[PDB]
Write a protein that binds this ligand. Structure first.
Ligand SMILES: CC1=C2C(=O)c3c(O)cccc3C=C2C[C@@H](CC(=O)O)O1
Ligand SMILES: CC1=C2C(=O)c3c(O)cccc3C=C2C[C@@H](CC(=O)O)O1
Ligand SMILES: CC1=C2C(=O)c3c(O)cccc3C=C2C[C@@H](CC(=O)O)O1
Lengths: 203, 202
């Protein structure tokens, strides 16, 4: 004994890290916990519900600095890199998250902290409220593409290079970047773009 | 009956999509609708996965990428995005389909060519132009998805608003903005942020 929600969640996360999402069935989980379905459902509900809890549990891995003046740009980037670290350390997690609710204790307080750091930058509400949404969406998407990946890049990269340079001039000349941009490079590139935009729209 | 063509196949599939949604689109359902055998259907379009690439590419014709007019770069970029957004909103389950798919194709590639042309015409260096295009279309697709997904806002707004203001000042103060910002308001904010940043990087 005995089944707790937190104990169920750590177990489901344990097997997600090891063997990935599709190997996370309620049956497998129930099997690991050596318990009956009934007790499992009562605690975490169904699989969507379980994922939700798993998503929230790993959010503690994300660190949101307290705002230092002079340092907003860099601090927001820290937060974002922290979120990406979480995604990279957890198989299939970005897949769990890009759909679902940070509406849970850990996500709720992480929001508060995130909103605090954003507003401190002189962003205004709509801008702060949305910016946080934008950054989160950005990081999650970039992380989904990362874990997604090979040679596709290479077959695609070459496919574009072969284009009739007379009709598809830009494509041939941009074939490289389009296809095979360093993951870290894309992240940092997108990070700067969004951050500069937020500042531009603050003042 | 007239000999099956790829385009008639694909138009019909889009019709089922639009009316009935992604999950009602099967090769069996499409065969029914077309009154043809599974061989001639497959001959033309392959499996469901391939069918979807074709459906996606055919709708891209609805998107308009202006030829660069000097003076108006920033606004023409927003124009292109609004048009791409329009297409998603006009088409059910589409943003979902686009989420794992390379536009590449007749219009797909043509519109990328035209997009990179607009981007670089703004003084964006190869790498900003290329990524900016990716970031821009990823942003539009994600907003579309979101918009389609959608009382809940009032429930969430109620919860955030009724929080201990001493514990969650920001979540209580930003209760509304967070809960719901029309899809239009979100979209434009997101556009101006990204376009301003592309300009800063250039
Ligand atoms: C859940 C959570 C966070 C977030 O959800 C988060 C985010 O969604 C987007 C961008 C940044 C963050 C940061 C955090 C930090 C985290 C801290 C905690 O709950 O202990 O709490
Ligand atoms: C391929 C294509 C387009 C695009 O791909 C596109 C885009 O990717 C992002 C934002 C806007 C657009 C617009 C178009 C328009 C269209 C080009 C054409 O075939 O005429 O078809
Ligand atoms: C969602 C997505 C893309 C697109 O959807 C896209 C598009 O819809 C029309 C024209 C071009 C594109 C390009 C992309 C690139 C990529 C972005 C990402 O997943 O980060 O994955």
């Amino acid at each position: 004994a005995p089944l707790t929600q937190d104990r169920i969640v750590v177990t489901a996360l344990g097997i997600l890290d090891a063997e990935g999402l599709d190997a996370l069935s309620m049956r497998r989980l129930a099997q690991e916990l050596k318990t009956g379905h009934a007790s499992l459902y009562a605690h975490v509900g169904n699989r969507d519900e379980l994922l939700d809890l798993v998503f929230d549990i790993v959010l503690t891995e994300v660190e949101v600095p307290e705002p230092e003046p002079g340092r907003w740009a860099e601090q927001v980037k820290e937060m974002c890199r922290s979120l990406r670290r979480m995604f990279l350390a957890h198989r299939d997690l970005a897949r769990i998250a890009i759909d679902r609710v940070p509406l849970g204790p850990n996500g709720m307080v992480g929001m508060e902290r995130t909103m605090n750091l954003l507003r401190s930058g002189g962003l205004h509400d709509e801008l702060a409220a949305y910016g946080g949404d934008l950054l989160s969406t950005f990081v999650t998407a970039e992380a989904l593409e990362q874990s997604s990946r090979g040679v596709f890049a290479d077959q695609l990269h070459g496919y574009l290079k072969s284009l009739p340079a007379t009709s598809f001039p830009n494509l041939v000349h941009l074939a490289g970047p389009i296809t095979s941009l360093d993951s870290d490079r894309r992240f940092e590139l997108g990070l700067e773009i969004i951050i500069a935009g937020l500042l531009a729209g603050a003042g």
